[PDB]
mmCIF file of N, CA and C in Angstrom:
data_model
loop_
_atom_site.group_PDB
_atom_site.id
_atom_site.type_symbol
_atom_site.label_atom_id
_atom_site.label_comp_id
_atom_site.label_asym_id
_atom_site.label_seq_id
_atom_site.Cartn_x
_atom_site.Cartn_y
_atom_site.Cartn_z
ATOM 1 N N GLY A 1 79.775 -38.293 -75.795
ATOM 2 C CA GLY A 1 78.502 -38.352 -76.488
ATOM 3 C C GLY A 1 77.894 -36.979 -76.703
ATOM 4 N N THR A 2 78.268 -36.029 -75.852
ATOM 5 C CA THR A 2 77.753 -34.669 -75.951
ATOM 6 C C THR A 2 78.761 -33.659 -75.416
ATOM 7 N N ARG A 3 78.432 -32.378 -75.542
ATOM 8 C CA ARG A 3 79.309 -31.313 -75.071
ATOM 9 C C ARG A 3 78.514 -30.050 -74.756
ATOM 10 N N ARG A 4 78.524 -29.650 -73.488
ATOM 11 C CA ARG A 4 77.801 -28.459 -73.057
ATOM 12 C C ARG A 4 78.473 -27.827 -71.842
ATOM 13 N N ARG A 5 79.796 -27.936 -71.779
ATOM 14 C CA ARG A 5 80.557 -27.376 -70.669
ATOM 15 C C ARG A 5 81.007 -25.952 -70.982
ATOM 16 N N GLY A 6 80.754 -25.039 -70.049
ATOM 17 C CA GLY A 6 81.139 -23.654 -70.244
ATOM 18 C C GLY A 6 82.287 -23.239 -69.346
ATOM 19 N N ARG A 7 83.511 -23.482 -69.804
ATOM 20 C CA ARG A 7 84.699 -23.134 -69.034
ATOM 21 C C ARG A 7 84.743 -21.635 -68.751
ATOM 22 N N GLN A 8 85.655 -21.231 -67.874
ATOM 23 C CA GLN A 8 85.799 -19.824 -67.515
ATOM 24 C C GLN A 8 86.925 -19.172 -68.311
ATOM 25 N N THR A 9 87.278 -17.948 -67.933
ATOM 26 C CA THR A 9 88.339 -17.214 -68.611
ATOM 27 C C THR A 9 89.446 -16.824 -67.639
ATOM 28 N N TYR A 10 90.688 -16.889 -68.106
ATOM 29 C CA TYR A 10 91.837 -16.544 -67.277
ATOM 30 C C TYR A 10 92.637 -15.406 -67.902
ATOM 31 N N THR A 11 93.031 -14.444 -67.073
ATOM 32 C CA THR A 11 93.802 -13.300 -67.541
ATOM 33 C C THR A 11 95.228 -13.706 -67.895
ATOM 34 N N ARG A 12 95.917 -12.844 -68.637
ATOM 35 C CA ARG A 12 97.291 -13.113 -69.044
ATOM 36 C C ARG A 12 98.153 -13.478 -67.840
ATOM 37 N N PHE A 13 98.063 -12.671 -66.788
ATOM 38 C CA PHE A 13 98.837 -12.908 -65.575
ATOM 39 C C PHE A 13 98.527 -14.284 -64.992
ATOM 40 N N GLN A 14 97.313 -14.766 -65.241
ATOM 41 C CA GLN A 14 96.891 -16.068 -64.740
ATOM 42 C C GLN A 14 97.413 -17.190 -65.633
ATOM 43 N N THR A 15 97.200 -17.050 -66.937
ATOM 44 C CA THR A 15 97.647 -18.051 -67.898
ATOM 45 C C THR A 15 99.167 -18.172 -67.898
ATOM 46 N N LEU A 16 99.845 -17.044 -67.724
ATOM 47 C CA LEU A 16 101.304 -17.024 -67.703
ATOM 48 C C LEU A 16 101.837 -17.596 -66.394
ATOM 49 N N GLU A 17 101.319 -17.091 -65.278
ATOM 50 C CA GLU A 17 101.744 -17.553 -63.963
ATOM 51 C C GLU A 17 101.417 -19.033 -63.774
ATOM 52 N N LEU A 18 100.144 -19.376 -63.938
ATOM 53 C CA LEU A 18 99.699 -20.758 -63.786
ATOM 54 C C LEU A 18 100.544 -21.699 -64.638
ATOM 55 N N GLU A 19 100.762 -21.318 -65.892
ATOM 56 C CA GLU A 19 101.556 -22.128 -66.810
ATOM 57 C C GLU A 19 103.029 -22.111 -66.415
ATOM 58 N N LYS A 20 103.443 -21.041 -65.744
ATOM 59 C CA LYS A 20 104.827 -20.900 -65.307
ATOM 60 C C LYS A 20 105.220 -22.037 -64.370
ATOM 61 N N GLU A 21 104.385 -22.288 -63.366
ATOM 62 C CA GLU A 21 104.647 -23.350 -62.402
ATOM 63 C C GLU A 21 104.230 -24.707 -62.961
ATOM 64 N N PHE A 22 103.095 -24.734 -63.651
ATOM 65 C CA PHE A 22 102.584 -25.967 -64.236
ATOM 66 C C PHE A 22 103.564 -26.529 -65.261
ATOM 67 N N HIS A 23 104.279 -25.637 -65.939
ATOM 68 C CA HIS A 23 105.251 -26.042 -66.948
ATOM 69 C C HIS A 23 106.323 -26.940 -66.338
ATOM 70 N N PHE A 24 106.761 -26.597 -65.132
ATOM 71 C CA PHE A 24 107.784 -27.372 -64.441
ATOM 72 C C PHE A 24 107.174 -28.588 -63.751
ATOM 73 N N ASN A 25 106.110 -28.356 -62.987
ATOM 74 C CA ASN A 25 105.433 -29.431 -62.272
ATOM 75 C C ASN A 25 103.989 -29.052 -61.961
ATOM 76 N N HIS A 26 103.119 -30.056 -61.904
ATOM 77 C CA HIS A 26 101.708 -29.830 -61.614
ATOM 78 C C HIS A 26 101.306 -30.504 -60.306
ATOM 79 N N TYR A 27 101.345 -29.746 -59.218
ATOM 80 C CA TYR A 27 100.988 -30.272 -57.906
ATOM 81 C C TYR A 27 101.084 -29.185 -56.838
ATOM 82 N N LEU A 28 100.046 -29.079 -56.016
ATOM 83 C CA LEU A 28 100.012 -28.083 -54.952
ATOM 84 C C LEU A 28 99.310 -28.632 -53.714
ATOM 85 N N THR A 29 99.745 -28.177 -52.543
ATOM 86 C CA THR A 29 99.158 -28.622 -51.285
ATOM 87 C C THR A 29 98.041 -27.687 -50.837
ATOM 88 N N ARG A 30 97.494 -27.949 -49.655
ATOM 89 C CA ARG A 30 96.416 -27.130 -49.113
ATOM 90 C C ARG A 30 96.849 -25.671 -48.995
ATOM 91 N N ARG A 31 97.859 -25.425 -48.165
ATOM 92 C CA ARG A 31 98.365 -24.074 -47.961
ATOM 93 C C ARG A 31 98.830 -23.462 -49.279
ATOM 94 N N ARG A 32 99.344 -24.305 -50.168
ATOM 95 C CA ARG A 32 99.826 -23.847 -51.466
ATOM 96 C C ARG A 32 98.675 -23.327 -52.321
ATOM 97 N N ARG A 33 97.628 -24.137 -52.452
ATOM 98 C CA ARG A 33 96.465 -23.759 -53.244
ATOM 99 C C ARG A 33 95.942 -22.388 -52.823
ATOM 100 N N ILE A 34 95.509 -22.284 -51.572
ATOM 101 C CA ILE A 34 94.987 -21.029 -51.047
ATOM 102 C C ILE A 34 95.973 -19.887 -51.268
ATOM 103 N N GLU A 35 97.261 -20.213 -51.250
ATOM 104 C CA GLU A 35 98.304 -19.214 -51.451
ATOM 105 C C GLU A 35 98.108 -18.481 -52.775
ATOM 106 N N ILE A 36 97.971 -19.245 -53.853
ATOM 107 C CA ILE A 36 97.777 -18.669 -55.177
ATOM 108 C C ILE A 36 96.314 -18.303 -55.409
ATOM 109 N N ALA A 37 95.423 -18.959 -54.674
ATOM 110 C CA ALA A 37 93.993 -18.701 -54.795
ATOM 111 C C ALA A 37 93.645 -17.299 -54.308
ATOM 112 N N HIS A 38 94.223 -16.909 -53.176
ATOM 113 C CA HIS A 38 93.973 -15.591 -52.604
ATOM 114 C C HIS A 38 94.870 -14.540 -53.250
ATOM 115 N N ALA A 39 96.080 -14.947 -53.620
ATOM 116 C CA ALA A 39 97.032 -14.040 -54.249
ATOM 117 C C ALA A 39 96.604 -13.696 -55.671
ATOM 118 N N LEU A 40 96.209 -14.714 -56.428
ATOM 119 C CA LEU A 40 95.775 -14.518 -57.807
ATOM 120 C C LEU A 40 94.305 -14.115 -57.864
ATOM 121 N N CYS A 41 93.679 -14.017 -56.697
ATOM 122 C CA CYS A 41 92.273 -13.638 -56.613
ATOM 123 C C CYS A 41 91.387 -14.676 -57.295
ATOM 124 N N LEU A 42 91.903 -15.895 -57.420
ATOM 125 C CA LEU A 42 91.161 -16.978 -58.055
ATOM 126 C C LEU A 42 90.516 -17.882 -57.008
ATOM 127 N N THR A 43 89.795 -18.897 -57.474
ATOM 128 C CA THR A 43 89.129 -19.835 -56.579
ATOM 129 C C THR A 43 89.891 -21.153 -56.498
ATOM 130 N N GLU A 44 89.854 -21.781 -55.326
ATOM 131 C CA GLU A 44 90.542 -23.049 -55.119
ATOM 132 C C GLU A 44 90.161 -24.058 -56.200
ATOM 133 N N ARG A 45 88.903 -24.015 -56.624
ATOM 134 C CA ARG A 45 88.412 -24.926 -57.651
ATOM 135 C C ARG A 45 89.002 -24.577 -59.014
ATOM 136 N N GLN A 46 89.162 -23.281 -59.270
ATOM 137 C CA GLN A 46 89.714 -22.816 -60.537
ATOM 138 C C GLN A 46 91.107 -23.392 -60.767
ATOM 139 N N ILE A 47 91.970 -23.264 -59.764
ATOM 140 C CA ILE A 47 93.332 -23.773 -59.858
ATOM 141 C C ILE A 47 93.342 -25.286 -60.046
ATOM 142 N N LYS A 48 92.509 -25.978 -59.276
ATOM 143 C CA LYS A 48 92.418 -27.430 -59.358
ATOM 144 C C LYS A 48 92.047 -27.873 -60.770
ATOM 145 N N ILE A 49 90.935 -27.353 -61.276
ATOM 146 C CA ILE A 49 90.474 -27.693 -62.616
ATOM 147 C C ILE A 49 91.478 -27.246 -63.673
ATOM 148 N N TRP A 50 91.985 -26.029 -63.521
ATOM 149 C CA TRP A 50 92.958 -25.483 -64.462
ATOM 150 C C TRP A 50 94.121 -26.447 -64.663
ATOM 151 N N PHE A 51 94.506 -27.136 -63.594
ATOM 152 C CA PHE A 51 95.607 -28.090 -63.654
ATOM 153 C C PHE A 51 95.202 -29.341 -64.427
ATOM 154 N N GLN A 52 94.014 -29.854 -64.128
ATOM 155 C CA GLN A 52 93.508 -31.049 -64.795
ATOM 156 C C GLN A 52 93.312 -30.798 -66.286
ATOM 157 N N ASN A 53 92.736 -29.648 -66.617
ATOM 158 C CA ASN A 53 92.489 -29.289 -68.008
ATOM 159 C C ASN A 53 93.800 -29.189 -68.784
ATOM 160 N N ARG A 54 94.725 -28.385 -68.270
ATOM 161 C CA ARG A 54 96.020 -28.201 -68.914
ATOM 162 C C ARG A 54 96.682 -29.546 -69.198
ATOM 163 N N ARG A 55 96.655 -30.433 -68.208
ATOM 164 C CA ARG A 55 97.254 -31.755 -68.352
ATOM 165 C C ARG A 55 96.562 -32.549 -69.455
ATOM 166 N N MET A 56 95.276 -32.281 -69.652
ATOM 167 C CA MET A 56 94.500 -32.970 -70.677
ATOM 168 C C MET A 56 95.093 -32.729 -72.062
ATOM 169 N N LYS A 57 95.500 -31.491 -72.318
ATOM 170 C CA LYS A 57 96.086 -31.129 -73.604
ATOM 171 C C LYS A 57 97.522 -31.634 -73.709
ATOM 172 N N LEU A 58 98.197 -31.724 -72.568
ATOM 173 C CA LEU A 58 99.578 -32.194 -72.532
ATOM 174 C C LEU A 58 99.705 -33.561 -73.196
ATOM 175 N N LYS A 59 100.253 -33.576 -74.407
ATOM 176 C CA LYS A 59 100.435 -34.819 -75.148
ATOM 177 C C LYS A 59 101.765 -35.476 -74.789
ATOM 178 N N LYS A 60 101.705 -36.746 -74.400
ATOM 179 C CA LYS A 60 102.903 -37.490 -74.033
ATOM 180 C C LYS A 60 102.598 -38.979 -73.893
ATOM 181 N N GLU A 61 102.094 -39.577 -74.968
ATOM 182 C CA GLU A 61 101.759 -40.997 -74.963
ATOM 183 C C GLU A 61 100.674 -41.297 -73.935
ATOM 184 N N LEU A 62 99.427 -41.337 -74.392
ATOM 185 C CA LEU A 62 98.297 -41.613 -73.513
ATOM 186 C C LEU A 62 98.200 -40.568 -72.406
#
């Protein structure tokens, strides 16, 4: 009904890396999340949402 969401921005290294693993599979554990969260200097929430968003665009029958 409306739209007022202000997503964030991801660097090339982030879009490439994130998509690198997401391309094969989309799923990470606790230790896994923090692993890329602290390594990529990103936030645990960023990775979580980034996965949900990417999957949203992923077209494959519903």
